[PDB]
Structures are given as structure tokens and as C-alpha cells.
Amino acid sequence: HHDITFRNIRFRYKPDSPVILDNINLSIKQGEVIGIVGRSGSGKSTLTKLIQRFYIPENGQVLIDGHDLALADPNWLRRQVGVVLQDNVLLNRSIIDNISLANPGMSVEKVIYAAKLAGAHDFISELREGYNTIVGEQGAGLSGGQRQRIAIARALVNNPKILIFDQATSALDYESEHVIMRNMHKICKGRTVIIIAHRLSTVKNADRIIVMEKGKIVEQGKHKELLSEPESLYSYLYQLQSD
Numbered sequence: 001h002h003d004i005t006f007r008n009i010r011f012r013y014k015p016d017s018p019v020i021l022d023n024i025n026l027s028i029k030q031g032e033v034i035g036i037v038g039r040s041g042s043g044k045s046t047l048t049k050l051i052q053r054f055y056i057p058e059n060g061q062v063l064i065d066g067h068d069l070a071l072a073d074p075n076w077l078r079r080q081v082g083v084v085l086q087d088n089v090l091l092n093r094s095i096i097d098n099i100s101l102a103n104p105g106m107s108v109e110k111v112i113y114a115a116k117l118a119g120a121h122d123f124i125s126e127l128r129e130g131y132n133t134i135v136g137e138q139g140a141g142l143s144g145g146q147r148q149r150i151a152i153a154r155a156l157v158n159n160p161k162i163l164i165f166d167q168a169t170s171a172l173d174y175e176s177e178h179v180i181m182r183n184m185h186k187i188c189k190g191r192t193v194i195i196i197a198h199r200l201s202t203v204k205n206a207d208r209i210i211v212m213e214k215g216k217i218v219e220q221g222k223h224k225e226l227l228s229e230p231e232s233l234y235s236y237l238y239q240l241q242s243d
């Protein structure tokens with residue numbers, strides 16, 4: 001059983017626009033943790049946009065959990081996928097409102113569980129106003145790494161079977177980075193995970209790494225296998241990011 005399948009996917013953003021995704025074929029097993037890497041503009045983000053049916057491919061199919069997304073209920077699909085957004089925590093609103101910003105009438109309990117997996121609960125619980133803390137600046141003063149753990153909690157709150165991490169657009173403080181990496185196995189447990197990675201090192205221990213270039217998957221495998229292809233793009237990108 002594959003949780004996510006792309007078959008022969010062709011996609012451009014607008015009728016005249018350039019083909020961005022060119023005959024993408026991908027099958028991700030349930031519970032697999034996938035890293036997608038590649039230069040900027042290679043199509044990484046577009047791939048995840050298709051998973052959420054934000055856009056519709058001119059050719060080929062996307063299937064989630066067996067189901068062709070053409071036919072799947074858009075509300076169900078929405079609940080099936082949690083996305084860890086970058087820089088998308090509403091400042092004028094409380095931590096709990098921010099975490100439950102999908103189903104506002106859900107359990108404080110479910111909010112807490114998700115913050116705990118995300119490694120946010122401990123810092124939230126030591127705030128004067130706790131979960132009612134208004135996230136925004138002067139109202140509290142949450143750091144960027146703290147807001148990011150809130151973003152993970154948000155993605156996790158409805159217990160999605162698929163979790164997607166959008167590419168990091170920023171550097172997090174060492175403590176936030178540390179807590180997240182320490183909790184990653186708990187966050188991903190029981191879910192099919194896609195991580196769009198800035199630094200290759202981020203997805204070193206993924207079950208499989210997908211290497212995209214100019215809208216195509218050019219290489220795929222575990223890190224060690226990808227580095228064994230002598231002239232691989234993966235090796236080149238790996239060398240470019242080495243210290």
C-alpha cells in the first residue's frame with residue numbers, strides 16, 4: 001500500500017506557462033519518510049501543492065491512500081494532510097487558537113498532545129498566560145524557533161496521516177532546532193512524511209531521498225546509495241554544502 005502516488009504527472013501553472021513538472025512518477029509507502037532535494041525552482045514545492053490539490057495536473061494522476069484526488073472529497077483530503085508552514089503564525093491571536101486554526105471547537109487535550117509532540121508544550125506552559133498568550137510581539141515576544149514549533153503543533157493537531165514540511169525560509173535558534181530534531185521520530189511516528197529540504201543534511205536519515213532537477217526526478221535512494229553514484233547530482237549538491 002502506497003500513501004502517495006504520482007503517475008505521469010504533467011503540470012504548468014498557467015495555460016501558456018512553461019511545464020514545471022515533467023512526467024513525475026513517484027510512489028511513497030505508508031509511514032515512509034521522504035526528503036525531496038534539488039536546486040531552487042526544480043519543482044519541489046509544486047510537487048507538494050499537487051498533493052493538496054491546490055492545482056490540478058493537465059496529465060497524469062495523484063493518488064492518496066489509493067484514492068485518485070480528482071474524485072476524493074476536498075474536505076477529507078484537507079484533514080489527511082498536515083503542512084508545517086513557514087512564517088504563518090497569526091500574531092494577533094493566542095497560541096491555542098493558532099494551533100487549532102482549522103477546527104476551532106476541538107479538545108484543549110488534542111491541542112496539548114500536538115504541542116507536546118512538537119516540543120512546544122514545555123515553553124508554552126511556563127508562560128504567564130500559557131496557551132492564551134497572544135503570540136504577537138510586545139504581547140509576549142515568542143522567538144522564531146518557538147513559533148515554528150507552534151507551526152508543527154498546528155500541522156499535527158488533527159492527527160494527519162501525511163505530514164509535509166515546507167522548505168525552511170529561515171534559521172532557527174539552536175534550542176528550537178535541537179528540540180525538533182530530538183522529537184522528529186515522535187512527530188513522524190505513524191505518518192507518511194515529506195520533507196522539502198534546504199540543506200541535504202536535514203534529510204540524511206530519511207528512508208529515501210528524491211532528487212529533482214528542472215521538474216524531473218533525476219535520482220532517488222538512501223543518502224549512502226546516492227553518494228555511490230560517482231557523478232550524481234546528489235553528490236554535487238552534497239559537495240557544494242560541505243564545510
Ligand SMILES: Nc1ncnc2c1ncn2[C@@H]1O[C@H](COP(=O)(O)OP(=O)(O)O)[C@@H](O)[C@H]1O
Pocket residue numbers: 013014020038039040041042043044045046047
Ligand atoms: N504560483 C506560481 N505561478 C507560476 N509559477 C510558479 C508558481 N509557483 C512556483 N512557480 C515556478 O515553478 C518553478 C518551480 O517552483 P517550485 O516548485 O517552488 O520549486 P522549488 O520548491 O524546487 O524551489 C519555478 O520556475 C517557480 O518560479
